[PDB]
Amino acid sequence: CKALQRDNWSSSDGKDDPIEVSKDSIFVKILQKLLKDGIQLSEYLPEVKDLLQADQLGSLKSNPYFEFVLKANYEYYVQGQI
């Protein structure tokens, strides 16, 4: 949650892919480290349901752009390991 709150989940200028744009986020960079250090993201990560039911996220817990970009990157990085 505090990694996701260091990352700027505000919307871009309407031309630009949220799986390309996410690759400078520190959350995606720690997922890329866990993958390069050998860990199964399918077992090591909390549920995308309940990472969204945690209250720590605060302002992000009302942001739909954050709600699909989080899901789109979980889908991309976990279904990339099957």
Binding site: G14, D17, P18, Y65, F68, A72
Partner: peptide, 8 residues
């Protein structure tokens, strides 16, 4: 349709 951009 899940992608937050019209092209996608």
């Amino acid at each position: 349709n899940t992608s937050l951009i019209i092209l996608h």
